[PDB]
């Protein structure tokens, strides 16, 4: 060990700059003479990972790791390994390697800052505080160190220490602040105010001191919105009402279009009990802002007189109908969610009286806007023929509006006509090809109309077309979600339709002379193969949204240092909250539920087709053999044609690169080994570790914990659901019946778990569900359910129909009851349930 270290030191400068081939050549020349060099292998792994290679880089890194016994080597190798782990989404190993390097003897304090970022990604703040303290004591000439120390002491719990540190820093640097460093300083001041907020509590002297400090720093703080908000909060936490009212009036003068400021002023003034005071206040404020909308929308929520309410509604709808806004119904969208038989008749009467005095030629714009508003109002009131008549009259009057076509497509979708709606919306979109919202709506409605190829062809227009025949790669690079969700649902519907198709084809079973279904089977086989391939592609596309969220969370590497260098601690806390709440999105929950349903269906049908029927030799023959008719050449030609078609299909639906993911066909995802383990270690642990209290889907947790052998979690979730959302829901009774049928000794599980669940049920719910009817086969649970919770619930009936194999409570009677109970709903939902859910 003499010349190899010199060559490594002379080649390290190539990696330090912007050189890769010259360093790789030197590493190869070194390894050609001695292959047992750990530093050279560790550098070559990172060099191959930084240029594009993945397999060779991982192999070299694994070899370098295996060629290490103790923790006593050069710190450069450990630093390179830490960089590699940081670049390969490995935080624990990177932290361990950096700690081992710093424990050996490194004179580079900046490495400590790296740890201050790494642990900042895993939440380990106990050692992060010490790392920040060391990195601050190492260099005393940058405000980023002070900001990082303040943030670390505020997040942990050292509030007084952070206040003292900020005070000492401001005393030492009083007057030595440049111009560009003023704003940041102001931001820091605001952050200190936030710290003082944590020292506010309910003490009078503390709040007075915070108010005095805020009034003293007001001439120095540049941010005025947050300053005035904190001032109003302090005034509300004390007792001064006039000063708080003045602050809120100043905020309104700064920005009148804000419902939050108006609500806070209403709460501060204490006039929420009397209606005349609020009426006079809003009538006086209307003269100050005649062009706003909250001052005219909020007073429509506490009116009791019918004549006054009608007059206010008329004065609110007259300017909107005169100027013509594409959101008039939106302006009354939330009110319709809270009022109905009391407000909607008066609004309809006013609109009819206004329309009876208009003219289709003198005032065409108010005429068409009144027609659109009437169509919206009737569509909201479950009316369809009159809405279609109004939209047809509007199209005949002025066929140059996209909103009319959008409303027609929405009505046709609500009436179960998806294809006609897609056709009308495409025809309307072809009128002007410059808007993207209408294109996205058309693609979504085509995906909802069992039309995927045309939807993709329409979407492949505004996308960047380079190394692909369509724009699927561009749609995946712009970070999409709704498109994938809407396309996977169409794939699932098309796959479920094939089940009914095969059932109808097998119901004949070659009845008498039925050679038509026997002589024609190649097309059916090709259609089934295509449907299976698209179903696999759907499962492949499902593995994207969680991966996208993981990539978004991992891309916060340089942000931990940027938020401290630029001086944005409040933005850092906001980013932390955003990263913690990432797993609380509705689209994420929907995608996770769909993935769970798919995995459970795959587990079920795999365990069903594993050991069933008989004669495997007569079933594993398939085709590719016509006896004495050249079977080898025929099978070879068939395989060649299938491969040639699959290559073109994969190039058409190309989304992921070939060097990044080889599972393009998706055959390995639909035939995995442990689906439940993968779903728990990839899709469930994150949602379990990052979740609130009231926002928690108990149905998905119950479905996940049912088929694993753990019933205590099921009982806890059921108890929490009954305590939160009450006990008068059909879902509670359905889950209780499912649990009672699962605790039967006939089902192969754990007798101890069944016994403890039975004891818990007998101890908790003793006068709700008969727990002594598990031995009688004549007791019908459907009658008891419809007597207690009733048959009007749809979610409970859907859950009982989904879990009917393990709970024998009938089938035909349940289906008839569901059909009879679905009638007071919308036709499209009824059709979808009868076609797929039933």
């Amino acid at each position: 060990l003499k010349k190899e270290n010199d060559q490594f030191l002379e080649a390290l400068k190539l990696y330090e700059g912007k050189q890769y081939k010259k360093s790789l050549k030197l590493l190869d020349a070194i390894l050609k003479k001695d292959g047992s060099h750990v530093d050279s292998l560790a550098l070559k792994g990172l060099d191959l990972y930084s240029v594009g290679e993945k397999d060779d880089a991982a192999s070299y890194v694994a070899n370098a790791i295996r060629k290490i016994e103790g923790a006593s080597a050069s710190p450069i190798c450990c630093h390179v390994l830490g960089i590699y782990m940081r670049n390969t989404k490995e935080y624990k190993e990177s932290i361990k390697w950096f700690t081992a390097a710093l424990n050996n003897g490194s004179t580079n304090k900046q490495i400590y800052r790296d740890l201050a970022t790494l642990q900042s990604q895993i939440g380990d703040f106990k050692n992060a505080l010490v790392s920040r303290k060391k990195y601050w004591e190492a260099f005393l000439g940058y405000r980023a160190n002070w900001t990082s120390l303040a943030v670390a002491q505020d997040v942990n719990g050292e509030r007084q220490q952070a206040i003292n540190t900020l005070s000492q820093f401001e005393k030492l640097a009083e007057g030595k602040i440049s111009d560009s460093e003023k704003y940041e300083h102001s931001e820091c001041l605001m952050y200190k105010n936030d710290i003082m907020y944590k020292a506010a509590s309910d003490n009078q002297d503390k709040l007075q001191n915070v108010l005095k400090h805020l009034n003293d720093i007001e001439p120095c703080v540049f941010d005025k919105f947050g300053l005035l908000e904190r001032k109003a909060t302090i005034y509300m936490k004390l007792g001064q009402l006039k000063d708080a009212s003045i602050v809120y009036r100043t905020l309104i003068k700064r920005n009148p279009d804000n419902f939050k400021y108006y609500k806070l002023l209403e709460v501060s003034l204490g006039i929420q009990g009397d209606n005349k005071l609020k009426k006079a206040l809003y009538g006086k404020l209307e003269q100050f802002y005649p062009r706003c909308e909250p001052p005219k929308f909020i007073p429509l929520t506490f009116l009791q007189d019918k004549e006054e309410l009608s007059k206010k509604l008329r004065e609110y709808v007259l300017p909107q109908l005169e100027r013509g806004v594409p959101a008039t119904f939106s302006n009354v969208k939330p009110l319709y969610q809270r009022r109905k038989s009391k407000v909607s008749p008066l609004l309809e009467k006013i609109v009819l009286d206004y329309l009876s005095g208009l003219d289709p030629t003198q005032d065409p714009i108010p005429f068409i806007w009144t027609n659109y508003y009437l169509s919206q109002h009737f569509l909201f009131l479950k009316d369809f023929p009159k809405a279609q008549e109004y939209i047809d009259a509007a199209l005949d009057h002025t066929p140059t509006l996209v909103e009319f076509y959008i409303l027609k497509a929405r009505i046709l979708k609500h009436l179960g006509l998806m294809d006609t709606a897609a056709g009308i919306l495409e025809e309307g979109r072809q009128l002007d090809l410059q808007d993207r919202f209408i294109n996205c709506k058309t693609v979504k409605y085509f995906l909802r109309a069992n039309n995927i190829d045309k939807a993709v062809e329409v979407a492949s227009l505004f996308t960047k077309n380079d190394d692909s025949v369509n724009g699927i790669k561009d749609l995946h690079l712009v970070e999409a979600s709704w498109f994938i969700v809407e396309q996977a649902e169409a794939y699932y519907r098309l796959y479920l339709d094939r089940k009914k198709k095969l059932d109808d084809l097998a119901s004949l079973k070659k009845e008498v002379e039925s050679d038509k279904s026997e002589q024609i089977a190649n097309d059916i086989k090709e259609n089934q193969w295509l449907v299976r391939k698209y179903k696999g592609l759907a499962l492949k596309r499902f593995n994207a949204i969680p991966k996208f969220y993981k990539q978004f969370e991992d891309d916060q590497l340089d942000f931990h240092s940027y938020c401290m260098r630029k001086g944005t601690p409040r933005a850092y806390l906001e980013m932390l909250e955003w990263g913690k709440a990432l797993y609380t999105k509705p689209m994420y929950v929907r995608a996770m539920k769909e993935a769970s349903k798919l995995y459970f269906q795959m587990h079920d049908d795999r365990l069903k087709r594993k050991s069933d029927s008989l004669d495997e030799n007569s079933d594993e023959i398939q085709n590719n053999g016509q006896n004495s008719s050249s079977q080898k050449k025929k099978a070879k030609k068939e395989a060649a044609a299938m491969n040639k078609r699959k290559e073109t299909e994969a190039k058409s639906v190309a989304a992921y690169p070939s060097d990044q993911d080889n599972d393009v066909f998706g055959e390995k995802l639909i035939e995995t080994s442990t689906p439940m383990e993968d779903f728990a270690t990839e899709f469930y642990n994150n949602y379990s570790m990052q979740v609130r209290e009231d926002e928690r889907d108990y149905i998905l947790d119950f479905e996940f914990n049912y088929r694993i052998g753990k019933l205590a979690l099921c009982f806890a979730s059921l108890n929490k659901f009954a305590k939160r959302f009450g006990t008068t829901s059909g879902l509670f009774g359905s889950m209780a019946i499912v649990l009672l049928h699962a605790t039967r000794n006939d089902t192969p599980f754990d007798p101890i778990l069944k016994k403890v669940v039975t004891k818990s049920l007998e101890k908790e719910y003793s006068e709700n569900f008969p727990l002594n009817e598990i031995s009688n086969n004549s007791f019908d649970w459907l009658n008891f359910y419809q007597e207690k919770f009733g048959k009007n619930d749809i979610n409970g009936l859907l859950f009982l129909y989904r879990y009917r194999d393990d709970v024998p409570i009938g089938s035909s009677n349940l289906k008839e009851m569901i059909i009879s109970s679905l009638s007071p709903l919308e036709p499209h939902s009824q059709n979808e349930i009868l076609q797929y859910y039933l």
């Binding site: 804000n258 100050f288 929520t301 809270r338 919202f437 906001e574 509705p586």
Partner: protein, 235 residues
């Protein structure tokens, strides 16, 4: 309705969805994260608001109302909709504004740069983008002390032209040939910003006849007079 507020990070993903329904030139998550964590006192958002309106009561009471499943029973969750932000709140538009930070070897003073302004086409023609731009310019002038503002506009989009050149009254600076991905020419506009002209209180009225009475907000006024229950001016 329309509610203007500051662009929070907890919704930027949904904001990106709005981009998918607006300008074709999309951006990655890093772009939006940088522009939302670098200067948060510039970019604003416009969403909806749903509050109470006579709960239960007695005058034509009905417990079978909608209210996004929040009245009686029907659980209490959020509707499956990527455009929603809260049970009764959805985003209708936003405006992203950045500051000059790249080196130019010329000592450029801190100026305003309007990055993007995207509002849903179905929710326009009622004062949204104009208010967002006014609030952004006022916040920049009050906090960052922006000397001027510079932005870009297209050509076929007559709405943006009427909003910037006509409504906001901006001055055209130069013409950039082939700037976007489609190879369409753009107009780079620039206007010197001031402090005594971008006040919101000076733009409370849309149009006027000739000589009206522009009333603003002075000191106290709402806590004066007497109780509106038995006075002279009590209805």
């Amino acid at each position: 309705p329309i509610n203007i507020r500051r662009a929070t990070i907890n919704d930027i993903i949904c904001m990106q969805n709005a981009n998918l329904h607006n300008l074709p030139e999309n951006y990655m998550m890093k772009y939006y994260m940088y522009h939302i964590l670098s200067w948060p006192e510039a970019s604003f958002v416009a969403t909806t608001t749903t509050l109470d309106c006579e709960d239960s009561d007695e005058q034509d009471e009905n417990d079978k109302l909608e209210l996004t499943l929040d009245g009686t029973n029907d659980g209490r969750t959020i509707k499956l909709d990527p455009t929603y932000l809260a049970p009764g709140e959805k985003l209708v538009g936003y405006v992203l504004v950045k500051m000059n930070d790249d080196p130019d070897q010329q000592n450029e003073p801190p100026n305003g740069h309007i990055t993007s302004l995207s509002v849903m086409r179905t929710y326009r023609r009622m004062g949204i983008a104009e208010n967002l731009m006014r609030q952004a310019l006022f916040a920049l002038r009050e906090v960052h002390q922006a000397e001027y503002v510079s932005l870009h506009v297209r050509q076929s989009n007559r709405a943006a032209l009427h909003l910037y050149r006509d409504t906001l009254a901006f001055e055209v600076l130069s013409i950039e040939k082939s700037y976007y991905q489609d190879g369409e020419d753009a107009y780079a506009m620039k206007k010197v910003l001031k402090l005594e002209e971008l006040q919101i209180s000076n733009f409370t009225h849309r149009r006027l006849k000739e000589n009206e009475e522009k009333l603003e907000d002075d000191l106290e006024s709402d806590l004066l007079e007497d109780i509106i229950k038995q006075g002279v001016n009590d209805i």
